[PDB]
Amino acid sequence: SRKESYSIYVYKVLKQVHPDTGISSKAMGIMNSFVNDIFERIAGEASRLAHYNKRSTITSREIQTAVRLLLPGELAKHAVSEGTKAVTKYTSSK
Amino acid sequence: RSRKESYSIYVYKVLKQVHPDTGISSKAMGIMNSFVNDIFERIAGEASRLAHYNKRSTITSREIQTAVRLLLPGELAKHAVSEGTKAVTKYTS
Amino acid sequence: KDPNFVHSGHGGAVAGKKNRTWKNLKQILASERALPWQLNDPNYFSIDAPPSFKPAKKYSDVSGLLANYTDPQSKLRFSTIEEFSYIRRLPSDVVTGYLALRKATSI
Amino acid sequence: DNIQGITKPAIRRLARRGGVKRISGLIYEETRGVLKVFLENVIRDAVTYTEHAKRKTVTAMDVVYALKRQGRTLYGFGG
Amino acid sequence: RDNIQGITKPAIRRLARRGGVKRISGLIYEETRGVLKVFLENVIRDAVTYTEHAKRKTVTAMDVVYALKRQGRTLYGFGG
Amino acid sequence: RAKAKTRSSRAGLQFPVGRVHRLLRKGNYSERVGAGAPVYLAAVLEYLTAEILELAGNAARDNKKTRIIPRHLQLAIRNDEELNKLLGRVTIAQGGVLPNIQAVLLPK
Amino acid sequence: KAKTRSSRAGLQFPVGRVHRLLRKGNYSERVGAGAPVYLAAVLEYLTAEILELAGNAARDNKKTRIIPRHLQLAIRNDEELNKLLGRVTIAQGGVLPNIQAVLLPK
Amino acid sequence: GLGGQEEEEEQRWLDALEKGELDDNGDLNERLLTARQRALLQKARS
Amino acid sequence: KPHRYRPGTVALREIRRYQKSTELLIRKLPFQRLVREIAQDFKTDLRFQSSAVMALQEACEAYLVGLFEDTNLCAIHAKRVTIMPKDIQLARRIRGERA
Amino acid sequence: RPGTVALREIRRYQKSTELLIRKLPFQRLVREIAQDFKTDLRFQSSAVMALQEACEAYLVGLFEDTNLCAIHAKRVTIMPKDIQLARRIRGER
Amino acid sequence: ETEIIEGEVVEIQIDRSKVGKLTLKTTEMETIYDLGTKMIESLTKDKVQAGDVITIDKAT
């Protein structure tokens, strides 16, 4: 039907990273599958964490915790910095 | 107040059937409660995947029959599938 | 040359996504069952024989002799001690063969 | 019986990507067994996903879900 | 302060002997202590992240059990 | 309506079909938990419970005692090649380890 | 007039799609609006950082078109990608160059 | 064709093989580092 | 250019060339044929997608490459530069993959 | 004699069920390793027992894999290189 | 002439009329047999269990 996926956002990120550069449909297949795998990984751990807390609400704090549980070391810190910056923009922008 | 919600009654009702002469220690009750609880999470987790892997909304006997066939090893899989079909056969009349 | 040169489009799949031939027999029967049949009419499916009223005699797989026995493992059926000495040595390739040869539980 | 079609040269090449300096002649026949039993895991799981879907065809998703369940996920197939 | 050395030389001897090893070269101890400390470090860090998320000061048996599920190195009998 | 009974008793099970249904339906494993699922799952859990208890009861009786202790469970599961796959990376509180040696160790 | 959640948070990645994927994914009956913002930003951070390594690996290895080998070079040169992905596999990415020490001749 | 450059790259990789002057992987600039990798190099310099 | 070589001088070129390139080392048809065997003993007459058979080969070769690296390090530890089937077993057992 | 009481020691700890590491040294070690994740932590008495059971089990499995490395290299004597081999081919690090 | 079954009973299964299934083993073969009602009301009546050796006069 309509291949519900991430390819145009992945390509828009590549053009933000290296505007001169381009990418094979196989490498985009890896990017989609990696993005969806990390999505299920984080959302799964966040739902477990919500059950462990007896919460319903998937808050920003739950995603942050699932992210720092799954990401190693300094990669966790810098991804947490990007996520907290994005929420800081969103909550300021209304 | 909170309540322990354990499987302790049912594992004991089964022990008293399989070894009528034998009892459960309080730490072995812990191991048995952990085993039942973990296998429930393992099976229901795979059943939730198996529904969305076919984009079905329900879970039913076929999702759990599939999850048992994937999760369990050799002889235990065919035995667990036999027990699930027997219980549902009696339950449906 | 020949009895015709301008053969008409009888109703196979001339340009559709489906297979070229007419409807197969199952589809002919599924459409023939829509007609205004009376209870007494000679329907092509009503000619099917009964299901057998007897229980069907057990004939052995590997030799065709009358089988008293069925194996708890291979579910082949056999008549004598030396036939069991053969059935347990067969490769699974032909065990699933003999079960499917009488359309048993093997799929 | 088709596992013998996996060639001794291909098994040398496949081992040489793993950086081994020297092979021994027993490795080729034992590697065929390791490949056959690895398939006899991942295929039976994939068929089980295929059966659940009521399919006759083993899809990319059927083998991807098996490989994901086996904890050896492959990126670049399915999504 | 200096607590990694508190994994005593007889305790290593016994734990390795439950593991069935015949001769311990005296080189083994500090790497075994460091390896243990790193496994503790991972489990503790995970348990602390569950505890910090839970708005809570006390590390519970559930937090270490959930860290052992997160690491796929589970432990029955402590609840869950 | 007069004299209610458990859906476990209707299935022919000890294991709690109501509890299993409640846990499936509040665990968010699906938007629609059909009642065949918790009956089937209760039966699966009850079978695995029977198999693992019977092996542990044999292990306890073989160790000359009339009680299941975690040691008798570890000495059941590490003596079964099926359950040592299903429980193949789980740890048992007070279970210890299976008694085992590589033959190269043994003297003379 | 409306504003996209993506641009409101400052991402390229689709915040509303992550919200719908949480909402339809049964991860809860209730989803906070900051959760898909944070999650989209982390997916974007991971995507941007791996692609920045991969495009550099392509440019260094005398090419420009990103292909699965450049993704394997991005994953295996950095220890925190290497631990995050670990035992997962890349279609036709191969293995990172390693003619093993000691076997490398004297 | 220009595959002669890859033949010379193999000759350079063979010169180092005959000398025994290669990395532990058998292989032959901080501006290539991401902001995280600059923070990790700062952590390696501290 | 020279003849017979110092043994392993072309084996080092094999490691280099098969590690620098990313193509699959088994040819397609032997594996395409093999995939239609293993299923039959559990379900007859299955049909295999063109993507699925390739994903199966990619998984099988990726699985063997990792097993060969572990086997290589086992041989090097066990003094040898030659791999033997007992190194494959040691790698499998410490991986926890059978026995 | 030596190596004979070292072998006879194996059967005692493989039959016996108790924990082999000292509780207070382990308890302080967990708290030490926690200090630079957070100050002023409280640890539940059951949690540190669970952590000790996990740590002794992790080491017993690593010691079996260490014994496999040594005995494959025809040694009854273990070496740190056996731990470096195991922690690589485990897929841990 | 007499019809005698004899063997170790390997496995024996019964469920609700009644339906059931018996297996036997000699030193040299195995079998699985579906049981008729008048065998069910005999194998159960005489408390037959797996590992017994039994001789059945088939006619009775």
Swiss-Prot record, chain C:
The keyword DNA damage applies. The keyword ATP-binding does not apply. It comes from Homo sapiens. Proposed core component of the chromatin remodeling INO80 complex which is involved in transcriptional regulation, DNA replication and probably DNA repair. Component of the chromatin remodeling INO80 complex; specifically part of a complex module associated with the helicase ATP-binding and the helicase C-terminal domain of INO80. Component of some MLL1/MLL complex, at least composed of the core components KMT2A/MLL1, ASH2L, HCFC1/HCF1, WDR5 and RBBP5, as well as the facultative components BACC1, CHD8, E2F6, HSP70, INO80C, KANSL1, LAS1L, MAX, MCRS1, MGA, MYST1/MOF, PELP1, PHF20, PRP31, RING2, RUVB1/TIP49A, RUVB2/TIP49B, SENP3, TAF1, TAF4, TAF6, TAF7, TAF9 and TEX10. Keywords: DNA damage, DNA recombination, DNA repair, Nucleus, Transcription, Transcription regulation. The chain holds residues 84 to 190 of 192 of the full protein. One of its GO terms (biological process) is chromatin remodeling. It is found in: Nucleus. GO terms for cellular component: cytosol; fibrillar center; Ino80 complex; MLL1 complex; nucleoplasm. It comes from the Eukaryota. This is INO80 complex subunit C.
Curated annotation (Swiss-Prot), chain H:
It comes from Homo sapiens. Induces growth and cell cycle arrests at the G1 phase of the cell cycle. Proposed core component of the chromatin remodeling INO80 complex which is involved in transcriptional regulation, DNA replication and probably DNA repair. It is found in: Nucleus; Nucleus, Nucleolus. This is INO80 complex subunit B. Component of the chromatin remodeling INO80 complex; specifically part of a complex module associated with the helicase ATP-binding and the helicase C-terminal domain of INO80. Interacts with RP9. Signal peptide: none annotated.
From Swiss-Prot, chain I:
The modification N6-lactoyllysine is found at residues 20, 43. The modification N6-glutaryllysine is found at residues 20, 43, 79, 86. It is found in: Nucleus; Chromosome. One of its GO terms (molecular function) is structural constituent of chromatin. The modification Phosphothreonine is found at residues 44, 71. Keywords: Acetylation, ADP-ribosylation, Chromosome, Citrullination, Disease variant, DNA-binding, Hydroxylation, Lipoprotein, Methylation, Nucleosome core, Nucleus, Phosphoprotein, Ubl conjugation. Acetylation is generally linked to gene activation. Acetylation at Lys-86 (H3K122ac) by EP300/p300 plays a central role in chromatin structure: localizes at the surface of the histone octamer and stimulates transcription, possibly by promoting nucleosome instability. H3R2me2a is present at the 3' of genes regardless of their transcription state and is enriched on inactive promoters, while it is absent on active promoters. One of its GO terms (cellular component) is nucleosome. The modification N6-(beta-hydroxybutyryl)lysine is found at residues 20, 43, 86. The modification N6-crotonyllysine is found at residue 20. The modification N6-(2-hydroxyisobutyryl)lysine is found at residues 20, 28, 43, 86. This is Histone H3.1. It comes from Homo sapiens. The lineage of its organism: Eukaryota, Metazoa, Chordata, Craniata, Vertebrata. The chain holds residues 38 to 136 of 136 of the full protein.
Curated annotation (Swiss-Prot), chain K:
It is found in: Nucleus matrix; Nucleus, Nucleoplasm; Cytoplasm; Membrane. Transmembrane segments: none annotated. Ubiquitously expressed. Highly expressed in testis and thymus. Forms homohexameric rings. Can form a dodecamer with RUVBL1 made of two stacked hexameric rings; however, even though RUVBL1 and RUVBL2 are present in equimolar ratio, the oligomeric status of each hexamer is not known. Oligomerization may regulate binding to nucleic acids and conversely, binding to nucleic acids may affect the dodecameric assembly. Interaction of the complex with DHX34 results in conformational changes of the N-terminus of the RUVBL2 subunits, resulting in loss of nucleotide binding ability and ATP hydrolysis of the complex. (Microbial infection) Interacts with Mumps L polymerase; this interaction regulates the viral transcription. Belongs to the RuvB family. The C-terminal domain is required for association with ATF2. This is RuvB-like 2. It comes from Homo sapiens. The gene is RUVBL2. The chain holds residues 134 to 199 of 463 of the full protein.
